[PDB]
Amino acid sequence: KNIDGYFKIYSKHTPINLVRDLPQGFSALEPLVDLPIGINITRFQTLL
Amino acid sequence: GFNCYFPLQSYGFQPTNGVGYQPYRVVVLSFELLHAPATVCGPKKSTN
């Protein structure tokens, strides 16, 4: 989330056992980091 | 040539120069505020 010039990141690693699709289980993401960057954001792209 | 001079001069920093011709190192600290959140701040005191 980019709010008020801060980029929030929340995250959760989780051990799974499937070949495809999202699991069914509920689990809440915790605050990872929070960055005071000030920039506007409208698009993004993944790095591989 | 005449009317056509190289634009830079070099200082004659002899050790026996009068004080007006001694070298001085200078630093200029320029502060600024934008709409980005503040990131440089003075230290905060704690009581016991």
From Swiss-Prot, chain B:
<feature type="region of interest" description="Disordered">
    <location>
        <begin position="35"/>
        <end position="48"/>
    </location>
</feature>
<comment type="function">
    <text>Attaches the virion to the cell membrane by interacting with host receptor, initiating the infection. The major receptor is host ACE2. When S2/S2' has been cleaved, binding to the receptor triggers direct fusion at the cell membrane. When S2/S2' has not been cleaved, binding to the receptor results in internalization of the virus by endocytosis using host TFRC and GRM2 and leading to fusion of the virion membrane with the host endosomal membrane. Alternatively, may use NRP1/NRP2 and integrin as entry receptors.</text>
</comment>
<comment type="subunit">
    <text>Binds to host ACE2. RBD also interacts with the N-linked glycan on 'Asn-90' of ACE2. Cleavage of S generates a polybasic C-terminal sequence on S1 that binds to host Neuropilin-1 (NRP1) and Neuropilin-2 (NRP2) receptors. Interacts with host integrin alpha-5/beta-1 (ITGA5:ITGB1) and with ACE2 in complex with integrin alpha-5/beta-1 (ITGA5:ITGB1). May interact via cytoplasmic c-terminus with M protein. May interact (via N-terminus) with host bilirubin and biliverdin, thereby preventing antibody binding to the SARS-CoV-2 spike NTD via an allosteric mechanism.</text>
</comment>
<protein>
    <recommendedName>
        <fullName>Spike protein S1</fullName>
    </recommendedName>
</protein>
